[PDB]
Design a protein around this ligand. Structure first.
Ligand code: CDL
Ligand code: PC1
Ligand code: PC1
Ligand code: PC1
Ligand code: 3PE
Ligand code: 3PE
Ligand code: GTP
Lengths: 320, 63, 459, 49, 347, 139, 120, 55, 98
């Protein structure tokens, strides 16, 4: 049985399974600052599992086969258009930011459910608390309007407060000109078309609000590029910090029940991601919404409830 | 079918519905009478049951 | 009547599970067999109403209207898949379901025996029509249309309900047969006057009477074509039918209070007709013409003369057919032009000769060219009114005159002229619409041949 | 197959299905038994047959 | 709230209502009222927002005033009669005081401003509970003592409830407020039919209970609280809005839907009691309720509204809350009209 | 109820002064009731403007009742038609226009004519017939 | 109307006496319609859960109709008993009060002076 | 003049405007507890003997 | 219908009037509520002591029993309005108006 009120009444707690090794970490940094590398290294050094950085189709990975659905069907926005044509009236950029926010929201939801259900710790590449660095860095670059920023802040406050901050977070400090050289050597033509001011603004927004406000919520671990190169030392650092900061200690089993209830209902998590605000890049029209929803319905495995679609290979539907 | 079909069917229907009509009128009149006087099986209202009363000799003689 | 009710109800599963392509074919054909079965119901005993059961009965007034509805049901199905082609299969199936539920409610209404059951289904016709008008409407004031239509109907419907339950308490039963056979004279009490008003004003709202007729130029003009024809053709006849049923227990009072409404229609049929002349939209012109014809039917009802009743019934049937055909023609032209002002596309008689004809005898029947059932139904009412009061004739004599004017005016200004050069989307006449106007027109002349059937119970 | 995770109801619960049919047949045969008892008891009540 | 604590509080609310509906002693009925009031406040305070505190307060002090008034009536009755049995009031002042003492609990008179406030402030589930379960007890007491009501006072109460509820519902876009006003209107209907035949009151109460249950659990399953949010449900989930509009047509009472059967039967009863102006008045003024019902239906299902792109993910994820008894509730909410005479089972 | 009964005791038409006084008192009573509700739900700002509000309401209502009474009695006496429902209808437009003339509005009192006069005709018809707005439980 | 009738025992569906009445037939149109409500409830239940509303969960729909019919039978028996009781109390009160139920000295239309209104 | 002006003003629009106007004065309460309970207070003696519901 | 009853009824009437009128605070209204309860207790006690309804003397005790419970719940409500509001006044309690 999935965890509900009846399980708490029966006696299914989560403080019992949760231990010191049950940690939720995000490894954050600049663009291609080795955050995925270091996240994987702390993952299998500390024995914790790893959810990769949520993107456009991470939610596509969560449901069904996991293949990345059509871009139009899965949020009608692409990172490549962001990199190539940044400023356009279609507003693909804020659609990208909002969809990435909601995807990282569900990534954190599943991550929290994991270590609150089985007790195994979780490691991540960025999260909600590091999600705002991008949006502010873009907005400072003449990228999006302040109405999009205010919609982002209003969605953040009403869809992030019900969650609680991570256990530890690792920062991999790599200088922005080194990041420019790294993207030079990367090769993908889209990330060539980047403003170095945007990269410096990502770095600034990281170590101006993210890390400071982090330090009052959990324990921060600032590592330079060379310092984060030797992963053994960073994992032995995260082992020995104190693990005694934030709302994590003062977290009773009843608030555990609340947060498990919240994470287990995905529609609740992203219920306020679709608040009626009528933003120029957010209102899909009645006709467009009708056609796109119909297209999603004709997509296999998305017409009936998961586990009932006969077209996909289900069975026993008539006594299910 | 023949006209006798409709004739006898209308006889039965008319008789049944006329019985329904004056039964409804009798229902209205009976309800009025029983609510006005109460000397009938329904429209009775609750009253205190006598078996609750205790008749044993109390402390005060002339209770 | 369950030989017509049960198949109509079972028609719902067929469409609701038919394939993505078979819904239209299946609904059309099986509705055609339903109309064929209801064609039997034209079998009428001399004077005794056919009493199938306690709750269902029919006579020479309900049967022609029932046949009209059942024969009509394929016609909306044929007129709808043009503007309903680009829709989801489930949505199309529900549109069909709304139409079947409408027809079912109309059948139970016309075959109802108790006045309360008649009221239940009579008003219950509102809901499917409301959905059809609101959701599938294409114009702006469709949302306003639904509010206007529902509230106008209900404002009369509820006092009728109060009057009916009061009658049930007093008389004993709302059964038509009882209230007619056990009818009692009505005293000229003012409480009885208000009871008559309650029993009359609902149907007169759905008649409509002049003044409180604003729901049609704001409802029929906006509804999808299927809704428009089912409204004008039959839903208008609901008030007339109900009045014909209810005037049995509404005498001799009626005459004294017949004076205000009668002339309200008599004068009103002029203004509406005049409003028809200075119109800009085809659908509004047809709606106002429908108001005028229904006002003539109102006059026929309140005369309470045998001849008036027969002419009334004939006019209801003929007007239903003619209004449905005229609305269908207007939809064809509008869809071909995607606009409804009757000046944008003129001189299409050459381009579409069969449409030119269909419009020609549609106007002729609307103009009441003898010996069509429209003309005989009109003339019977005219003679009854003249017997009741002579001066009526000039007002009557005015009406068709003005009617004739607009009865040809749109035909002059939509096909009898020069085509507009910048438009080119007028394609060859799809034989669907031509056939549809055929199924509209041939039954009209067929009933013209034998009008003893649509002549009503007084014949 | 399609869904990476097991479905909430994908393989139907033999338990709940079993109780569903078990109660339904109970309701049906209790209904029949009750109807027979009522008809016979009504027959013997007023002494019809 | 610990789930066991919530279960105990719900059981105490239900036990207070049961104590009201099973006790003969007046003091025991008041004790049931007190237990209901005592256990109701934490249920509202479950979500713990300032709206919840505001609403729970306004709920409390009104109910406390009503219950103290109910004691004044009970004590006067005992003084003038010497009986605690719930039969009838032997002092006209006591009953013409308890009529509004039992009215603020229902929230129908000008003692109704608390209802929209508490409904909006507290959560939707506790709103369902407040608008459905918290009305059986005072209505049960009114049904027991209906034999000795001053009809003028009760009818005036019912008329004011209907009129102000229907009018106030016309000017709110929040679903909780217009449901509170709809509940006020239905209170007016049942309370109007109360003095003549309490069986029709019970029938209307049952229909309203099931139909409000269906409406509210549809709202919860749609996770909507404002008109725009509910309108947005069409893109994510259309069957909810499709059932929404049918249930709203039942709210207005349009036959052949279930909602007509009370409105119908009530009209049939009081016209038997020579009351003709009153049924016509209510029948006409129910159109104010119907107007905002159709306004809600228009911008929920009959016209699809501008959606939000992130709903592409919302369609990707299904619901988890089961919403038990909902499909049955809709069925008794729309098609029970052909089984109308079954109301004799209540009698 | 006795205050309303004052109108009942005076036969319609005759004793026009007493009937006018009784109708004025009915109007004034309704006026202070409405003004009390107004200053309760809608907050005033001070004592003197509160008196202004309640005086405006009671002035409007007392004028309405007074002119209704006067029109009714003089119309029933002049035309010798006491049972005439239209006797109250002049009280409607009198009740209408001045009410608009109390609010300095034209359409207000124009529609008030028809509305108030029609309701006055029906209430008078309540005297003519045996209508009961609050019918005691009979069946 | 009957909540105060003598001999009533509270909180029990059928008060034993009702077995003397003909039980409602299993074919009864009211009963089968209440079974139809059971089918409908299954259709919404599958539709409400994004399921193949016609074919999904045959057992769930089958349970729905069976449950409705059972409560349908008992409600119909309860419904008919009250209406029978209404007639019983009616006629018994009619017989017990002959003076309040006068009989009418029957006469034909040939002697009734029914006024005729000329329809002009 | 008649249809779109006087016929709208005579029945539908007038009633709609009346309901619109006075539903506002009904539903614009400031929500304060003090005035709500003051209105309850006034209704108390208005029902008590001002209308003489007691007798 | 004797005299002391008049004084207790009149005291309850003024306490009902005082409850139904607020000035600033929440504690004062609660005190007026418990005064209403006091008047109820005194009245009922007088009634049952006078009538020698010996089995009914428990009724004022149960009255006080639920009296204290309501007072406690009301003042906890005031605790929460103070926690979220700093003070206890009612005119500033307006967040639910819209
Ligand atoms: C009339 C005839 C027709 C009607 C017949 C009756 C119909 C009843 C319908 C019930 C619908 C239940 C539902 O879906 O509730 C959802 C809703 C909660 O939805 P949610 O927000 O998704 O739930 C989150 C959890 O509660 C989060 O829970 P948590 O983790 O905070 O822990 C608390 C949890 C604890 O749960 C458990 O312990 C289990 O509470 C619940 O689960 C709530 C339900 C408890 C039920 C207890 C029943 C005791 C008997 O609960 C309620 O509305 C409960 C209201 C009280 C009971 C229902 C009363 C309704 C009917 C009143 C009138 C009755 C007829 C009068 C005549
Ligand atoms: C709706 C409006 C209903 C009538 C309102 C009152 C009008 C009035 O006082 O009329 C008096 C006059 C008095 O006429 P009268 O005095 O010749 O007859 C009255 C009736 N008897 C004889 C039984 C006493 O009556 C009417 O005007 C009746 C009009 C009926 C038709 C109304 C149609 C409205 C649309
Ligand atoms: C029971 C109900 C009746 C008794 C209780 C109510 C008594 C008071 C009645 C009046 C209420 C307020 C009316 C407000 C009003 O008239 O505002 C000016 C109203 C509304 O004005 P307006 O605000 O629409 O003016 C602007 C117009 N537009 C928007 C087009 C630019 O004036 C009018 O409607 C025109 C004059 C009156 C027209 C109708 C007169 C005949 C009577 C009709 C009803 C017949 C039945
Ligand atoms: C379909 C549309 C119409 C629906 C009408 C309502 C149907 C559902 C409600 C009826 C069944 C459930 C209630 C009846 C029941 O079981 O017991 C009633 C009651 C319960 O006992 P009771 O009558 O002592 O207590 C309830 C009191 N009343 C009836 C006033 C609400 O009656 C009986 O069980 C029989 C003995 C007393 C008879 C009176
Ligand atoms: C009268 C009832 C209908 C009144 C009109 C309803 C609203 C207007 C119609 C369109 C509503 C929007 C919509 O999407 O409708 C279709 C919807 C299901 O859509 P879809 O998911 O494509 O269905 C797959 C089925 N296997 O499915 C529905 O809308 C179902 C409609 C059911 C209506 C209630 C029936 C109750 C019982 C009678
Ligand atoms: C509204 C105002 C109602 C009160 C107006 C004052 C007149 C009056 O007494 O009305 C109560 C009415 C009749 O009272 P009674 O004294 O019998 O007759 C009038 C005596 N001059 O009592 C009645 O029961 C008679 C019917 C009253 C009017 C009912 C219809 C009112 C108009 C339609 C609804 C608006
Ligand atoms: N607009 C936007 N883009 C984001 C956000 N988070 C991540 N991305 C994009 O997702 C990708 C993240 O890449 P990074 O992890 O920074 O770098 P990388 O090249 O993958 O290399 P590693 O950091 O070593 O994993 C880039 O395309 C980012 O622009 C966000 O919050 N907003």
């Amino acid at each position: 049985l999935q965890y509900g009120p009846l399980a708490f009444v029966l006696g299914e707690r989560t403080t019992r399974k949760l231990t010191e090794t049950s940690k939720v970490i995000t490894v954050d940094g600049n663009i291609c600052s080795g955050k995925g590398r270091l996240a994987r290294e702390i993952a299998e050094k500390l024995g914790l599992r790893h959810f990769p950085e949520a993107g456009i189709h991470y939610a596509d990975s969560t449901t069904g086969d996991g293949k990345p659905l059509d871009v139009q069907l899965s949020g009608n926005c692409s990172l490549e258009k962001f990199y190539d044509d940044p400023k356009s009236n279609d507003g693909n950029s804020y659609r990208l930011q909002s969809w990435l926010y909601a995807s990282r929201l569900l990534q954190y939801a599943d991550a929290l459910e994991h270590l609150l259900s089985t007790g195994q710790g979780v490691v991540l590449e960025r999260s909600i608390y590091s999600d705002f660095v991008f949006l502010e860095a873009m907005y400072r670059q003449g990228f999006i309007r302040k109405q999009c920023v205010e919609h982002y802040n209003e969605v953040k406050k009403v869809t992030a407060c019900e969650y609680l901050p991570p256990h530890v977070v690792v920062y991999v400090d790599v200088p922005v000109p080194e990041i420019q050289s790294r993207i030079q050597k990367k090769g993908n033509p889209h990330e060539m078309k980047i403003t170095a001011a945007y990269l410096q603004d990502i770095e600034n927004a990281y170590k101006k609000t993210f890390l400071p406000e982090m330090s009052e919520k959990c324990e921060v671990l600032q590592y330079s590029a060379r310092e984060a190169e030797d992963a053994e030392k960073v994992v032995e650092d995260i082992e020995y910090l104190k693990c005694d900061k934030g709302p994590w200690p003062d977290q009773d089993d009843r608030t555990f029940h609340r947060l498990r209830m919240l994470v287990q209902n995905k529609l609740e998590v992203l219920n306020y991601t679709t608040i009626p605000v009528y933003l120029p890049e957010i209102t899909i029209g009645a006709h467009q919404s009708d056609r796109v929803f119909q297209k999603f319905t004709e997509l296999p495995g998305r017409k009936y409830s998961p586990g009932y679609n006969e077209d996909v290979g289900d069975k026993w539907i008539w006594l299910k | 079918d023949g006209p006798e079909k409709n004739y006898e069917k209308t006889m039965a229907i008319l008789q049944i519905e006329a019985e329904k009509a004056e039964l409804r009128l009798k229902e209205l009149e009976v309800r009025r009478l029983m609510r006005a006087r109460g000397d009938g099986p329904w429209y009775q209202y609750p009253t205190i049951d006598k078996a609750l009363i205790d008749h044993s000799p109390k402390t005060t003689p002339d209770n | 009547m369950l030989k017509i009710i049960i198949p109509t109800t079972m028609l719902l599963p067929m469409t609701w599970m038919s394939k993505h392509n078979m819904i239209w074919i299946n609904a059309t054909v099986h509705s055609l067999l339903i109309s064929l079965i209801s064609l039997s119901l034209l079998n009428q005993l001399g004077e005794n109403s056919l009493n199938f059961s306690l709750t269902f009965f029919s006579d020479s007034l309900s049967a022609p209207l029932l046949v009209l509805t059942t024969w009509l049901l394929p016609l909306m199905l044929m007129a709808s898949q043009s503007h309903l082609s680009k829709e989801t299969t489930t949505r199309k199936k529900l549109y069909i379901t709304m139409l079947i539920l409408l027809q079912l409610f109309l059948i139970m209404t016309f075959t109802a025996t108790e006045l309360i059951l008649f009221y239940i289904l009579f008003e219950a016709t509102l809901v499917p029509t409301l959905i059809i008008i609101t959701r599938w409407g294409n114009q702006t004031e469709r949302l306003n249309a639904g509010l206007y239509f529902l509230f106008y109907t209900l404002a009369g419907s509820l006092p009728l309900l109060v009057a009916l339950v009061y009658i049930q308490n007093t008389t004993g039963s709302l059964n038509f047969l009882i209230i007619h056979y056990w009818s009692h004279p009505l005293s000229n009490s003012w409480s009885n006057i208000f009871m008559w008003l309650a029993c009359i004003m609902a149907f007169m709202v759905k008649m409509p009477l002049y003044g409180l007729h604003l729901w049609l130029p704001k409802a029929h003009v906006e509804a999808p074509i299927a809704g428009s024809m089912v409204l004008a053709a039959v839903l208008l006849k609901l008030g007339g039918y109900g009045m014909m049923r209810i005037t049995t227990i509404l005498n001799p009072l009626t005459n004294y209070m017949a004076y205000p409404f009668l002339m309200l229609s008599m004068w009103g049929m002029i203004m509406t007709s005049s409003i028809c002349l200075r119109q800009t939209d085809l659908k509004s012109l047809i709606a106002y013409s429908s108001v005028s014809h229904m006002a003539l039917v109102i006059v026929a009802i309140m005369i309470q003369t045998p001849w008036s009743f027969m002419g009334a019934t004939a006019l209801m049937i003929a007007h239903g057919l003619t209004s449905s055909m005229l609305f269908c023609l207007a939809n064809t032209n509008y869809e071909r032009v995607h606009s409804r002002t009757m000046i944008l596309a003129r001189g299409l008689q050459t381009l579409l000769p069969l449409m030119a004809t269909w419009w020609l005898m549609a106007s002729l029947t609307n103009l009441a060219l003898p010996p069509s059932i429209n003309l005989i139904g009109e003339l019977f009412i005219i003679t009854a009114s003249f017997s009741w009061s002579n001066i009526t004739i000039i007002l009557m004599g005015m009406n068709m005159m003005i009617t004739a004017l607009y009865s040809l005016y749109m035909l002059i200004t939509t096909q009898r002229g020069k085509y507009t050069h910048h438009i080119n989307n007028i394609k060859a006449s799809f034989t669907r619409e031509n056939a549809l106007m055929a199924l509209h027109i041939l039954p009209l002349l067929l009933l013209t041949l034998n009008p003893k059937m649509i002549l009503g119970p007084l014949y | 197959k399609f869904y990476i995770r097991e479905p909430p109801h994908g393989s139907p619960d033999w338990l709940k299905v079993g109780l569903t049919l078990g109660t339904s047949v109970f309701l049906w045969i209790y209904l029949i038994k009750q109807h027979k008892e009522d008809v016979l008891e009504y027959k013997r009540r007023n002494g019809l047959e | 709230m610990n789930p066991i604590i919530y279960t105990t509080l719900i059981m105490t609310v239900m036990s207070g209502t049961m104590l009201v509906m099973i006790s003969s002693h007046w003091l025991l009925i008041w004790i049931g009222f007190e237990m209901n009031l005592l256990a109701m406040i934490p249920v509202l305070m479950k979500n713990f927002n300032p709206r919840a505190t505001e609403a729970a307060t306004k709920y409390f002090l009104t109910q406390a005033t009503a219950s103290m008034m109910l004691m004044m009536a009970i004590i006067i009755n005992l003084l003038y009669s010497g009986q605690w049995t719930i039969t009838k009031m032997f002092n006209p002042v006591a009953m013409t005081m308890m009529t509004m003492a039992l009215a603020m609990k229902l929230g129908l008179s000008p003692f109704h401003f608390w209802v929209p406030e508490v409904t909006q402030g507290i959560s939707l589930q506790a709103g369902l509970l407040l608008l459905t379960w918290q009305k059986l007890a005072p209505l049960s007491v009114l049904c027991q003592i209906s034999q000795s009501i001053n009809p003028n006072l009760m009818l005036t109460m019912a008329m004011l409830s209907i009129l102000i509820g229907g009018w106030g519902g016309l000017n709110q876009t929040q679903l909780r407020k217009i449901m509170a006003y709809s509940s006020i209107a239905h209170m007016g209907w049942m309370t109007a039919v109360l003095p003549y035949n309490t069986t029709m009151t019970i029938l209307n109460l049952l229909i309203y209970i099931t139909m409000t249950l269906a409406m509210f659990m549809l709202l919860i399953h749609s996770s909507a609280t404002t008109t725009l949010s509910l309108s947005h449900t069409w893109n994510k989930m259309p069957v909810i809005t499709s059932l929404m509009m049918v249930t709203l047509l039942s709210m207005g009472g349009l036959p052949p839907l279930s909602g007509f059967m009370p409105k119908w039967m009530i009209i049939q009863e009081m016209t038997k009691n020579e009351s003709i102006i009153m049924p016509t008045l209510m029948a006409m003024t129910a159109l104010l309720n119907l107007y905002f019902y159709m306004r809600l239906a228009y911008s929920s299902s009959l016209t699809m509204f501008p959606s939000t792109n992130n709903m592409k993910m919302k369609w990707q994820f299904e619901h988890t809350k089961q919403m038990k008894l909902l499909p049955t509730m809709i069925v008794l909410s729309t098609l029970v009209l052909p089984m109308t005479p079954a109301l004799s089972s209540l009698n | 109820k006795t205050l309303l009964h004052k109108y009942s005791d005076i036969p319609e038409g005759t004793e026009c002064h007493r009937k006018a006084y009784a109708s004025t008192s009915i109007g004034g009573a309704t006026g202070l009731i409405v003004s009390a509700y107004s200053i309760a739900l809608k907050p005033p700002a001070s004592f003197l403007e509160g008196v202004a509000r309640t005086g405006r309401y009671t002035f409007t209502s007392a004028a309405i009742g007074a002119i209704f009474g006067l029109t009714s009695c003089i119309s029933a006496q002049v035309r010798e038609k006491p049972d005439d429902p239209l006797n109250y209808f002049i009280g409607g437009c009198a009740g209408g226009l001045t009410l608009g003339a109390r609010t300095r509005s034209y359409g207000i009192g124009a529609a008030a004519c028809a509305y108030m006069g029609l309701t006055a005709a029906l209430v008078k018809m309540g005297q003519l017939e045996g209508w009961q707005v609050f019918a005691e439980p009979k069946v | 109307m009957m909540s105060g009738r003598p001999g009533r025992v509270p909180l029990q569906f059928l008060p034993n006496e009702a077995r003397s009445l003909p039980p409602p037939k299993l074919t009864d149109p009211r009963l089968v319609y209440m079974g139809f409500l059971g089918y409908c409830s299954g259709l919404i239940d599958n539709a409400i859960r994004r399921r193949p509303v016609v074919s999904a969960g045959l057992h769930r729909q089958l349970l729905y109709v069976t449950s409705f019919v059972f409560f349908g039978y008992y409600l119909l028996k309860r419904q008919d008993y009250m209406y029978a009781l209404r007639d019983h109390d009616m006629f018994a009160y009619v017989k017990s009060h002959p003076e309040d139920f006068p009989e009418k000295d029957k006469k034909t239309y040939g002697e009734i002076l029914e006024e005729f209104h000329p329809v002009r | 003049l008649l249809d779109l002006i006087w016929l709208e003003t005579i029945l539908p629009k007038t009633t709609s405007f009346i309901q619109m106007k006075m539903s506002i004065m009904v539903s614009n309460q400031k929500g304060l507890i003090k005035l709500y309970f003051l209105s309850f207070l006034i209704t108390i003696m208005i029902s008590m003997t001002l209308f003489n519901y007691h007798e | 219908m004797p005299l002391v009853y008049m004084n207790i009824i009149m005291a309850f009437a003024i306490a009902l009037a005082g409850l139904l009128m607020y000035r600033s605070h929440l504690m004062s209204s609660l005190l007026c509520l418990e005064g209403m309860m006091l008047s109820l207790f005194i009245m009922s006690t007088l009634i049952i002591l006078n009538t020698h309804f010996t089995l009914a003397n428990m009724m004022p005790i149960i009255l006080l029993v639920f009296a204290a419970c309501e007072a406690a719940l009301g003042l906890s409500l005031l605790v929460m309005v103070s926690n979220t509001y700093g003070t206890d006044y009612v005119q500033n309690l307006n967040l639910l108006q819209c």
